[PDB]
């Protein structure tokens, strides 16, 4: 029970991300009931989650948490329902989670957010159809792009190219971005895309899932029917030859290999599976959270 931490955590868990030393970041929001807000949590003990009494820190937010991501080792970047993108930073003692800035720049729900290679800029997508490039140091919007014609479902920064990132939208467009070009967007040639994931070890390679349950492997084509519902997220494992964790609204998790073949399958969740994160310490342990308030620790056979 750390100070300035809510005694009750919201039911719907939306995101879970490991950092370098192994602490688990939890993002949750209440999507039903009287109050519709969200919270942020830090668990230096991953197995103690999601119990609120045995966490390292916590804080309540004004609105829900649609997406989040780490910023370095003490920074948390949040995509809020309120149309704002927030940045929170741990103290030197890592016992409090303090708001660094809160800028209301999007006109609708900020659905996705991603930190670029330099660690000083980030790209955000919202249901207002806009995509914004942020200056995390000056707390200002560098550029504002309206390339899509529908909700921006997912944006993913390039792992090593600081100016490149991917975005998909319900307009059935997958856009490759490069802010060095005069026209920075470029369309990559079905069913609506819903999740993007760069390949960690190959520059021009990424994978995307559609709302029909198909994961595809695309170069700058191989695809398999992995789920029976919308593919919510795609995460690669940190191995030299990485695996592919795919979570969906069918309440199941799948682990794929180089050729999108199924090696593992978990149905431990009873509601939607919202995120997956690979442990940096144990490369075979995989942590998944969902709207059933479950934090499952999978042992993926390798």
């Amino acid at each position: 029970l750390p100070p300035n931490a809510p005694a009750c955590m919201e039911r719907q868990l939306e995101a879970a991300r490991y950092r370098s030393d192994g602490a688990l970041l939890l993002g949750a929001s209440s999507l039903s009931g009287r109050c519709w807000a969200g919270s942020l949590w830090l668990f230096k003990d991953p197995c103690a989650a999601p119990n609120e009494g045995f966490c390292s820190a916590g804080v309540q937010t004004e609105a829900g948490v649609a997406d989040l991501t780490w910023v370095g080792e003490r920074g948390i970047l949040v995509a809020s329902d309120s149309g704002a993108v927030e940045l929170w930073e741990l103290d030197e003692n890592e016992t409090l989670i303090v708001s660094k800035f809160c800028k209301y720049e999007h006109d609708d729900i900020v659905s996705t957010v991603s930190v670029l290679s330099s660690g000083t800029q980030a790209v955000s997508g919202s249901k207002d159809i806009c995509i914004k490039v942020w200056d995390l140091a000056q707390q200002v919007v560098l550029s504002s792009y309206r390339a899509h014609a529908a909700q921006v479902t997912c944006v993913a920064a390039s792992p090593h190219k600081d100016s490149v990132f991917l975005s998909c939208s319900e307009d059935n467009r997958i856009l490759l971005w490069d802010t060095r070009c005069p026209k920075p967007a470029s369309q990559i040639g079905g069913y609506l895309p819903t999740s993007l994931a760069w390949h960690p070890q190959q520059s021009e390679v990424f994978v995307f899932g559609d709302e029909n349950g198909t994961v595809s492997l695309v170069d700058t084509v191989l695809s398999s029917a992995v789920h029976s519902q919308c593919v919510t997220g795609l995460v690669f494992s940190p191995h030299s030859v990485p695996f592919l964790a795919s979570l969906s609204e069918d309440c199941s998790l799948a682990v794929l290999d180089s050729s999108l073949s199924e090696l593992f399958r978990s149905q431990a969740h009873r509601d939607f599976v919202r995120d997956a994160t690979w442990s940096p310490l144990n490369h075979s342990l995989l942590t998944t959270v969902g709207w059933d308030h479950q934090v499952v620790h999978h042992v993926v056979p390798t």
């Binding site: 719907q12 929001s29 999507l31 039903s32 009931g33 009287r34 109050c35 519709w36 807000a37 004004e62 609105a63 829900g64 649609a66 809020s80 329902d81 309120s82 149309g83 704002a84 209301y104 720049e105 999007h106 006109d107 609708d108 729900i109 249901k127 207002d128 159809i129 792009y145 309206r146 390339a147 899509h148 014609a149 529908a150 909700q151 307009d171 856009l175 070009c181 005069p182 026209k183 920075p184 967007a185 470029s186 369309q187 069913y191 609506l192 709302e211 029909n212 029976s228 519902q229 609204e249 069918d250 309440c251 009873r270 509601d271 939607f272 709207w291």
Partner: protein, 625 residues
Amino acid sequence: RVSSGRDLNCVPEIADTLGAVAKQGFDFLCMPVFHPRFKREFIQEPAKNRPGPQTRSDLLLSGRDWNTLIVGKLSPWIRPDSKVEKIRRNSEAAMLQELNFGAYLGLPAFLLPLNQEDNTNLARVLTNHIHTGHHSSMFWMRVPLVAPEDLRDDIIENAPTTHTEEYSGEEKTWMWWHNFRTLCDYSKRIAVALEIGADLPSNHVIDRWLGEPIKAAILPTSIFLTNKKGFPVLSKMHQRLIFRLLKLEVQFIITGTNHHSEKEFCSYLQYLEYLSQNRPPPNAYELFAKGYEDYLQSPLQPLMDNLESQTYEVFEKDPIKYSQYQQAIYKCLLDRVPEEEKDTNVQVLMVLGAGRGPLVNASLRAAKQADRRIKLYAVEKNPNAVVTLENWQFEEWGSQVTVVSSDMREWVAPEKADIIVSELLGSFADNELSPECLDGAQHFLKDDGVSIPGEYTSFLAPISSSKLYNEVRACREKDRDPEAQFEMPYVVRLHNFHQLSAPQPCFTFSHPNRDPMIDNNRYCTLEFPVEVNTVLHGFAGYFETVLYQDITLSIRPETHSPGMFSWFPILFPIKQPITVREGQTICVRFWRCSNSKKVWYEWAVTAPVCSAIHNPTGRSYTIGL
């Protein structure tokens, strides 16, 4: 005084949000009844067995607050027209759930988006909901002026935006709405919430939404400019649209977050109240007709029927109309009685249809300012109005005025008249049988006599108004033809409508009619060049009349008598709307038919398509002789 609302997609607490909204000065709030991100499964396990509650409790607001303050928003993930079957099934069930919950709350209106071309299944689910219990709740279809695809930044390198004019493509959003409301059979509960983009389209796109049931105008904060002081304002082009929308009395909805964070959030709202106070105030006529806008009225038949007292009182409340009569009599007296005969020449004037004597007083005023002698007869067949005339005649007028309680067609005049004056004109000039009445009275007009009015002419113009077509459609009565309401004219202060062509003359009558072979039947063909894409719902009627020489009365818009309340336009509806493309000609035919008992109108459209003949044999509408 503007009725404005605030659009939100994020409500942490209803009590706290609604208070902050009202304190900023809004009248209502658009918010989701379920969390926008709270996707729900209805078929497949284990997600369908998600433990509740599924949304907020209805106890968080009073019944009066749900009835008057909250507007429900459909959740954005609900796509009943998705190409995925599993997503269609869930969306149908979720749409029925959210709509039924909104009805459970008694919400005054519910917001649904039109953001793509195919909303067929969205229309079916909504139509099914409408035919489930009779309710008054409204459905606002959110539709942008410009589709999002047609306003995206030209930043995709291998997919450049269109740089050539697509006249019909730039009207695509109206085609979205038109196809949707047509699938829903023109339900009176389905209205438009027009969304205004940062860049306005061409004028023909805004004129497309003329005559459409626009209930709300959505204004994003991202379209406002910033003046020197730092407050949000609008461009002169956007101001021009707001002024057009204020004439429609729509409700304005502010959406998007506060980008002018240096100012408080009611600053956007104060600018709307600012633009509202600055506009031409009611110009007497608009002050009078306000309240009768788009209100259908049965056309008076003062021959067949006896008008009530307060009907005459309204006739007498238009001084500009009668001063035109007084001037017409004034000019006529001078042309007939030379100066050297002003004491020996007594002119016999006969008001034919005197009512309660406004023309009689207008005649007495004319003879005085002209300095000529007149002998007055006041003929009026309405015996109840004759009571007013005879109390007037005994108390003031005296022996100068002679009241005659008789029909002008049967009255045996003791002498012939130098001037006959009449006010038997309707909104379509002759739709009260002024030709037939003045014909029968002609025998006691002198061979050189003058009739006032001398001649009149009716006008027609094709109009587009889905609102008025719906109101006519709502005039079905229990024990008559289910389509008879489309085969009869209506007097109405036309408002939310679109005139598709310049008015053209239809019927003309002249008095006295020296012709030996009098025949008041008419048949007229008109061809209206339409320079836009639209839907034809009916023809507006006006009239011009010549009291004497240059003194005239007119309700025709381009020659409207300035400052005259009298006579609203008339509306001839058609059973079935007719699509008209740009450059096509609308060809309409009109007949004035009659027998010994009744007079009536028949009309048909012959181009671009043929309509059925309307009111054949006066089966649905006749004017009593």
